[model samples]
Every structure is written in C-alpha cells, then in structure tokens.
Target: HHHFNLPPGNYKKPKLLYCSNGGHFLRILPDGTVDGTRDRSDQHIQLQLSAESVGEVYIKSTETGQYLAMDTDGLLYGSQTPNAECLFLERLEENHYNTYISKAHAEKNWFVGLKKNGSCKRGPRTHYGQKAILFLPLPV
Candidate 1:
C-alpha cells in the first residue's frame, strides 16, 4: 500500500523475495508506486486468497517514510492485473530501501501479474523513465 517517488533513472523493478521472520509481498505499479502487502496476501499473487483465509498484509516505503496495512480478504481481487508481484528485496539507496518478501515468499509460490504497462520491459531504452520500485528487508 506504500507509495514511493524514485529519482529519474533506469532503475530495476523490485521483486518480492521471502524471509523467515515474516511473509512479505511487493507489487510495482506502472505509475512507479510500490506496494508491500504482508501476510494477508500470503505472497501468492496468482491465486486469489479466499475472503475467509485473508490475513494481515503490510507495506512500507523508505523514501517517503510511509507504511500501509490491509486484509487480503477485504481487497478487490482480480482487479489489479498486468503488474507482476514478486518476492525479491533489492537495495537502491545508500542506507534506505523498501522491504520485499524473503526466500520463503519465493519458495512458496510465484508472484502474480496485476497489470500491463510498458515499464516492465527489461533492458536499456531511450527514455530511461523516472520511476522504480525498490524492496529490501531490514534486520529486526
């Protein structure tokens, strides 16, 4: 649910990796917003979580110092499409970065694609763009 405004550059999109402490999920919006939905989503973006099985989901942003929480059961499923959600934590700043799922997230299941946007293209392009999603895990 957290959103971040990254500097203009060809930054790599964040992936939803997994961690043993807690389950983490990351989604990169075409508009450059990164969402970190916690346990609620179960890091399973492809399969829809039944309303009865929804849990607590959390998202955080280091650039804007923001955090968001939600219950997957309450969210409108299948509406968010084309965008791929993954569990990879990457560092994009000197000392600040977002949180992504850890190895556990990946081992459990693959991420889901929520939407379709030109931003997903991999490799160097002319524009280079001005938005990116960065996810990283912090030590407790």
Candidate 2:
C-alpha cells in the first residue's frame, strides 16, 4: 500500500512542498490565499504538517497560522479552522514526488495543483497523477 510517515506538527522543522511542474513551493499568504512560489524567500511559505490518520494531514502555514483548505469550487485557500475541507490525502507516487488531493473531493480527484506561472489550478480542472500536482517535500 502507498504510505508516507510524515512527522506531525513540528514547527521547528517546517517543510516546503515544492511543485514539480514549475519548481514552485506551496505558499499561503497571511490573508489566507494559497499559491506557489519559485523559492522560499518569504516566510509565509514555510508549512507545518499535522497528521490526522494514515496518509491524511492538515498543512498549515507556520507564519500565517492558517490551515490549507479547498473551497467547494475547487479553489485552494487557508482556513482559520481545521474543517473537513482542510484535510488532505497525501500520497507518494512512484515518481518519488507526493500528490495532495482534497479528502472532501476525493471522488472528483481534486488535487492541489499549480500553474507554470505559480498560480493555483482550480480543483475541478485538476486530476490525479498530473505533474502539476506532484510535489517534493523539503525540510526548511
């Protein structure tokens, strides 16, 4: 079975989820907006992971203190509460990168994806196994 032993809620060792499509790092702003950045120059990009179950976790921005969440429209944002929309199913693919799909939208395969210009790809347009949805988690 596919599994990854992600450390839970360790802020000291925050990680950056680097996107494979554009070499961008998943970043959430103080205002709760989510996007991708080419580098970690901004402190808002550093993220901490809190595991909920096997392969399931909530990603929060260490600086903003907001949890990563996707709206019903498949738009990604950070939320103040860890609702069901904030839960993500993290999977390690055979290519050695990870794919984070929204647990609330698992039936639709609404993956967290980014564009080449660093903007988020809306959930409805995204699917599983796309390079835009693949990420490499690196310790900060």
Candidate 3:
C-alpha cells in the first residue's frame, strides 16, 4: 500500500483533474500533447497517479502512456520516460482544492496551472493561492 497523501485507495484508478480557474479538465492528447479541455473526454482527461515518495507523485496520461513533466523553464510537457522532472507534490490546500507543484522546481514555486481560456499556464508564472492552480480530482 502507498503511504502518500493522495486520494487514498483511488491512486491506482484513472481520474479527472478539474481545474478551478478555467472550469476545464487537464488533458493529454493521443500524441502526448498536454492542455486543458473545456469538456470531458474520457480518452484525454484521465490520468493515473503513481507515488514517487511520501508527498510526491507521478502523473501518467491513461490515453498516451506518457508522464506529465515540467521543464526547468517551467513548460509543461509529456515525456516517454519518467525522470526527475516528472515528480510533483500533491498538496491539499486549506480550501480543500489540490495543487500539483513541480517537485524538481518547488523551490521556485512552480505549479500546474490552467488559464481562464482553457490553456495551460507556464509553471514559473504560477504560485500557491491562484485559482488557476487549484484542482479538484473527480472520479471518471
């Protein structure tokens, strides 16, 4: 059993990450593209969470089998290999919304954010309390 702070037993199952700011779902395309979609597409928005450490996890797209990674430049992308950049800290904020911050870049306060226009926000420009970075994980 995993000891991480993720959603308990649901870690092995696919789930949808609903962005609070854009009211959209985080999606990974068939070609390993990452973005935010306004509608629910089971094939694109589902992700499998795997723990990296006590508070860190790796996000893998169920559709593409690619891991979500954030570069040093704060760009979000999908990598075929799960490297150091693929680790994220799953934080449960006081608002009860979860924030996924880059484990490799946490010292820089980089987070996974979605804009109001349904676009992905650069991690370097994101922070702790923004609605753009608050995500509510839901069952698919």
Candidate 4:
C-alpha cells in the first residue's frame, strides 16, 4: 500500500514549525497541552526535527523535551519513550510547508491533521483543513 501515497519530502535541518492555519502552537507544558490555545506571543510552542531512515523525521517539543507521539485512537501527545508511534514523515505542500504525515514505521497511512474545532489530531492522509494541519516556523 506504499504506492497509495507519494514519496515524502526531505526535511533535513532541524527547525521549529507550527500551524499557520490554526494559529495554535504544538505546545509543550508541565501539565497538558491543547490545540485550541489562541495566545501565541508568549506561550508559543516550538518543535525541533530529527531525520530518520528516509524522509521521515522525529519531532520533539522544546518546551517539554519530549517527542510528539500520537495515540492509538488518533490523539496527540508527547512521549519521552521513542518508538514507531512517534516517527513522522513530511509531505511538502504550498508556502514552504508540509503536511506532517504519521505513517507508522511498521504500517501505512496515518497523518497528523486536524479536527473541526481546531484540535490537532490524526486522520487519513486525505483529511481537510484550511486552518488545522499545515505548519509554519515560529520565527526564532
């Protein structure tokens, strides 16, 4: 089923990226994080990138120092323990950004997209989001 999708884009250098559509940073906190936060100036979240075998990258939150890992039910959370669930790949889109894909290391077709209320969650690669999933840099 690998043929079902296009090849991933190369995200070599590490950077802090987020959603321009949602206006929400992929936050890291001492407590819990949410995608609905609108205040961006002070509490902004920043993510760092690490490359994998191919075009995939391991994303880590600079706030929590943990990797952004998705749950089995398609929820977003940060994990300190590294594994296949946390491995992410990138699919380049318009405006120097990429739809962060979540195709599992031992599986196929999982993407980090959005829900109706601007929540960051996972869905099929074809999920729609004008302001939900696509990310931009935090401008360091």
Backbone clashes counted, model 4: 0
> Scored by CA lDDT, what does every candidate get?
0.27, 0.84, 0.82, 0.59
In angstroms, the error of model 3 at 57 is 0.4
Q: Look at candidate 1 and tell me the lDDT of residue 100.
A: 25
Better of 1 and 3 by lDDT: 3
Q: What is the lDDT of candidate 4?
A: 0.59
* Deviation from native of the Cα of residue 45 in model 1, angstroms: 6.2
Off by over 4 Å in 4: 1-14, 32-36, 42-44, 105-108, 114-117, 122-131
TM-score of each candidate structure, all chains considered together: 0.21, 0.89, 0.90, 0.71
lDDT of 1 at 24: 43
Question: What is candidate 3's TM-score against the reference?
Answer: 0.90
Going through the candidates in the order shown, the clash numbers are: 23, 0, 0, 0
Instruction: Return the lDDT, model 2, position 124.
Output: 91
TM-score of 2: 0.89
Best by TM-score: 3
The lDDT of model 3 is 0.82
By summed lDDT, the worst window of 10 consecutive residues in model 3 runs over 1-10
Best by lDDT: 2
lDDT of 2 by residue, 1-140 (tens): 32454433333567999998998999998888889887668788788987798778899988878999999999999999899999998877654777888999988889999988899999998976578998888888
